[PDB]
Design an enzyme around this catalytic site. Structure first.
Site, PDB file in Angstrom:
ATOM      1  N   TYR A   1      -2.348  -4.415 -11.673  1.00  0.00           N
ATOM      2  CA  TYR A   1      -2.049  -3.408 -10.666  1.00  0.00           C
ATOM      3  C   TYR A   1      -2.323  -2.007 -11.193  1.00  0.00           C
ATOM      4  O   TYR A   1      -3.014  -1.207 -10.552  1.00  0.00           O
ATOM      5  CB  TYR A   1      -0.580  -3.579 -10.262  1.00  0.00           C
ATOM      6  CG  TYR A   1      -0.106  -2.628  -9.178  1.00  0.00           C
ATOM      7  CD1 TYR A   1       0.376  -1.353  -9.464  1.00  0.00           C
ATOM      8  CD2 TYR A   1      -0.125  -3.039  -7.857  1.00  0.00           C
ATOM      9  CE1 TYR A   1       0.829  -0.515  -8.454  1.00  0.00           C
ATOM     10  CE2 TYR A   1       0.297  -2.203  -6.843  1.00  0.00           C
ATOM     11  CZ  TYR A   1       0.769  -0.951  -7.161  1.00  0.00           C
ATOM     12  OH  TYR A   1       1.232  -0.120  -6.167  1.00  0.00           O
TER      13      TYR A   1
ATOM     14  N   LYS B   1      -5.161   0.537  -9.796  1.00  0.00           N
ATOM     15  CA  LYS B   1      -4.785   1.843  -9.252  1.00  0.00           C
ATOM     16  C   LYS B   1      -5.421   2.991 -10.033  1.00  0.00           C
ATOM     17  O   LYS B   1      -5.832   3.996  -9.440  1.00  0.00           O
ATOM     18  CB  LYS B   1      -3.269   1.979  -9.194  1.00  0.00           C
ATOM     19  CG  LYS B   1      -2.579   0.988  -8.228  1.00  0.00           C
ATOM     20  CD  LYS B   1      -3.066   1.136  -6.798  1.00  0.00           C
ATOM     21  CE  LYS B   1      -2.181   0.384  -5.770  1.00  0.00           C
ATOM     22  NZ  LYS B   1      -2.711   0.521  -4.366  1.00  0.00           N
TER      23      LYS B   1
ATOM     24  N   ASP C   1      -4.283  -5.712   9.210  1.00  0.00           N
ATOM     25  CA  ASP C   1      -3.367  -6.375   8.297  1.00  0.00           C
ATOM     26  C   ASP C   1      -3.787  -7.831   8.252  1.00  0.00           C
ATOM     27  O   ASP C   1      -4.297  -8.369   9.239  1.00  0.00           O
ATOM     28  CB  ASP C   1      -1.930  -6.238   8.802  1.00  0.00           C
ATOM     29  CG  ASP C   1      -0.904  -6.372   7.699  1.00  0.00           C
ATOM     30  OD1 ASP C   1      -0.712  -7.496   7.214  1.00  0.00           O
ATOM     31  OD2 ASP C   1      -0.294  -5.351   7.304  1.00  0.00           O
TER      32      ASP C   1
ATOM     33  N   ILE D   1       9.006   3.041  -3.848  1.00  0.00           N
ATOM     34  CA  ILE D   1       9.425   3.269  -2.481  1.00  0.00           C
ATOM     35  C   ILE D   1      10.285   2.102  -1.970  1.00  0.00           C
ATOM     36  O   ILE D   1       9.967   0.983  -2.194  1.00  0.00           O
ATOM     37  CB  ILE D   1       8.134   3.374  -1.587  1.00  0.00           C
ATOM     38  CG1 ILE D   1       7.201   4.508  -2.108  1.00  0.00           C
ATOM     39  CG2 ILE D   1       8.510   3.575  -0.110  1.00  0.00           C
ATOM     40  CD1 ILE D   1       7.809   5.897  -2.128  1.00  0.00           C
TER      41      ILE D   1
ATOM     42  N   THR E   1      10.815  -0.206   0.509  1.00  0.00           N
ATOM     43  CA  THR E   1      10.212  -0.893   1.662  1.00  0.00           C
ATOM     44  C   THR E   1      11.003  -2.182   1.884  1.00  0.00           C
ATOM     45  O   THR E   1      12.014  -2.439   1.205  1.00  0.00           O
ATOM     46  CB  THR E   1       8.785  -1.332   1.382  1.00  0.00           C
ATOM     47  OG1 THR E   1       8.836  -2.142   0.228  1.00  0.00           O
ATOM     48  CG2 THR E   1       7.896  -0.195   1.225  1.00  0.00           C
TER      49      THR E   1
ATOM     50  N   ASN F   1      -4.877   1.193   2.273  1.00  0.00           N
ATOM     51  CA  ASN F   1      -3.493   1.039   1.865  1.00  0.00           C
ATOM     52  C   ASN F   1      -3.103  -0.378   1.489  1.00  0.00           C
ATOM     53  O   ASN F   1      -2.188  -0.531   0.680  1.00  0.00           O
ATOM     54  CB  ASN F   1      -2.590   1.602   2.983  1.00  0.00           C
ATOM     55  CG  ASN F   1      -1.141   1.221   2.821  1.00  0.00           C
ATOM     56  OD1 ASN F   1      -0.407   1.842   2.056  1.00  0.00           O
ATOM     57  ND2 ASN F   1      -0.722   0.182   3.520  1.00  0.00           N
TER      58      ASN F   1
END
Ligand SMILES: [Mg+2]
Ligand SMILES: [Mg+2]
Ligand SMILES: [Mg+2]
Ligand SMILES: [Mg+2]
Ligand SMILES: [Mg+2]
Ligand SMILES: [Mg+2]
Ligand SMILES: [Mg+2]
Ligand SMILES: [Mg+2]
Ligand SMILES: [Mg+2]
Ligand SMILES: [Mg+2]
Lengths: 251, 251, 251, 251
Positions: free
Chosen positions: B157, B161, B39, B190, B192, B91
């Site tokens: 984005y 993707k 990360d 999602i 998060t 990811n």
């Protein structure tokens, strides 16, 4: 090590007496689902149930014909006697005659549509509300790579498998509110008993060449994906088509 | 009960310090993979590694920037010191500026392409041969539902993707001979930490309405699919895109 | 007999000096659009413009580099001097190095992304508002069959062409309110000057075998679809990807 | 200005007496094809033929039922008497009952499959060899956006339209050698006589909101794409699905 979060419930597996259906039934039962194995062939359904029971699992057989709408209801009732029905796998299917569209016999066309499409619909008519009444769950419809691409001389099969993607999408949209997930799996060519018993070496090499992995798939490689999608770990997966095809459709 | 056949190997998880990446790392480590959490945020990567270790698993952190091609190689070397690298999950990602195509700032466009596409490529350049040298395995690229549909004002984005689906197909075709599977996962929206911390109630209701299940997904619902696809049970799955989207793309 | 409803406006065709771009330019101009042919190769752009003018049409050349964002603006201004810009075809592209993902040179990867993706974006940043200001119209982005499937050793190209489908979807969603349609065309392998000049006979037979029609496509067979989609007859077509591939992706 | 390269041949248009079918018939005939308009409704088929003839075109009506396999053969014979049959548009269709999968009446399911899928197959059994015998040509099957996405309560329609994509792919692969192209068109929601006569304002606004262009499509906007795909300009287009959907499926 693979284990699926499928216990505390029953599962219908149609066409469960051999090949991919057998693998699906074994895999679900090994992770604790109570499996109702249905098949037109009673000997085969009984044999798979015996394998499950000998391995410590819970299963029962029901022999019959998925093209009879009443058999779909009898299957749901029998599964619910084991444990609450929360998984149904509509896997029974036939290949049909090999002939181009223009020459395809009408009775073979209608038969393939009846088994590979309409019997899935009849199954879902019994399964959807029943699974909803047990707190939700999952229906896995067995499409193919031939739900998204063609293959000369098998138009009835290709057509029926394409149809299943739409039936899957629609039931997913309609029964999401009851937490009934509906998904489709798309296997590439798989080495089952029909393949290793009748397919000539030239045919096999030709099909293997169409998969990037250079081999046909194995039944257990389809069953794992089915069991995953049928499980509580797949709780946000609905409406979608999932290929297990060795790269066939990536070119 | 879910357990994944991922032990006896190491796994890289990029962007592993929070949200979906954190869930992926925890799930892989709980099934026995030795996880290298990378990360940009060192505090977060260290925190996830501490959670893994406290739960009895095996993990190490490496903080750095996936847009540096050398960091991809450092990640592979660090993972191989734990156990043979056989899983990589690309990811890490950013959302970019919100602006229509015609107004999109050049530096934000280039930044989103760099992180969401090019850093995946840099990762794969290190990962593909390394996993091949360890007997094969799996690379899971984190696309989105926005790898197959659009979403106004996030064109960089969406574009990145979509690009990932092609990079995934190509690497799958090219490295199938070494038994390196390459797949893409497509989550819906999602919940998060960014979502529950900054998203207004009107926005949330709008997004929930676009998913048939009527809710956003949870990180663990993405992680399960990733862990499945990274595992030996997914041995015939390569080249393909797998949605975990609550029905978003089925309408 | 084919005629396209494209008159009373100007059209940009990038990469218009040869091959598919040349055919697109000729077809649009023969139906009355005023065509701005852009190309890095000035000789080729001038030659196509001369063909158009000799056939009675209206065209002008502008030689330059689509990877320069300023060239996109210069192209829009030059087209508007002919007639209101209402069509833009982003067609310029390069194939890239042939190498698997793991070995792909960084400078070749970045170059292919820059021309095949980012220059399309730079073009659209100039084109979208300009076409909106002229009452709407159409942008046609030249993807490929490799926007939806892979092809070993050309990952940068495949990745960029996949990316274009998302850029197309997003601009379609964002500029629909201004009646700017945005679509993508996906040709199969086409017999252009590069193919008939350098492709060996074994390669040609291999590629022909991948198309159901048993041949490569011709530039005019791509240009017709582009001209249709750029025309007023295509007024309800936006966001979508349209294959002209001889059946390549149907198997 | 749009003109289609469709002269010197005949064309069958099923469901040609109204709405999209009427527009297709008018557009083909205005570009010189000799059109056989078939419809269950004789008054409507005769009216469209009269419009064609009054505008200077060539057409004949044949009233009958596409679910009778013999009617497909009678249609081919009648078209060939006008000029060589080289275009067939399988457009007749019904919507079916509105009901979720679990409640869908068996007779309505079977009826929708029969008209929207099986009658297309019966048509193609007559059309494919006949068009091959006339030097090739094109079959255009009328799918929908509901051939690729779902729509709650219309599962039979969605299922049949998905099926058509596979039937289209397969016939394209099988008859490419005879130069018979087979394609599918996917309209979004279109303002036909059923829509403007019965659809309530709230429903209309809801559907319009699902299309990026903010309106329903017009029949002539579908007919143009059909006529293009049926024409000699579309000579490299086969097997593929072509959306005319105002952006519906791009989100
Ligand atoms: Mg019995
Ligand atoms: Mg014959
Ligand atoms: Mg293919
Ligand atoms: Mg550290
Ligand atoms: Mg503005
Ligand atoms: Mg959608
Ligand atoms: Mg000049
Ligand atoms: Mg090497
Ligand atoms: Mg009559
Ligand atoms: Mg009810």
């Amino acid at each position: 090590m693979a284990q699926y979060d499928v216990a505390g419930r029953s599962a219908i597996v149609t066409g469960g007496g051999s090949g991919i259906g057998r693998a699906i039934a074994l895999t679900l039962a090994a992770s604790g689902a109570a499996v109702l194995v249905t098949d037109l062939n009673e000997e085969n359904a009984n044999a798979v149930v015996a394998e499950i029971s000998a391995a410590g699992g819970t299963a029962r057989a029901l022999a019959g014909d998925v093209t009879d709408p009443a058999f779909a209801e009898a299957s749901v009732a029998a599964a619910n006697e084991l444990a609450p029905l929360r998984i149904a796998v509509n896997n029974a299917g036939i290949g049909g005659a090999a002939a181009p569209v223009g020459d395809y016999p009408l009775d073979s066309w209608r038969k393939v549509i009846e088994v590979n499409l309409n019997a899935v619909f009849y199954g879902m008519q019994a399964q959807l509300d029943a699974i909803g009444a047990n707190g939700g769950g999952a229906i896995v419809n067995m499409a193919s790579i031939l739900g998204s691409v063609g293959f000369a001389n098998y138009s009835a099969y290709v057509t029926a498998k394409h149809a299943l993607l739409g039936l899957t999408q629609n039931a997913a949209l309609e029964y999401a509110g009851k937490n009934v997930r509906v998904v489709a799996v798309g296997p590439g060519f798989i080495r089952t008993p029909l393949v290793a018993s009748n397919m000539d070496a030239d045919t096999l090499a030709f099909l293997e060449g169409k998969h990037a992995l250079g081999r046909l798939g194995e039944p257990e490689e389809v069953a794992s994906l089915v069991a995953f999608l049928a499980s509580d770990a797949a709780s946000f997966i609905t409406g979608s088509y999932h290929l297990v095809d060795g790269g066939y459709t990536a070119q």
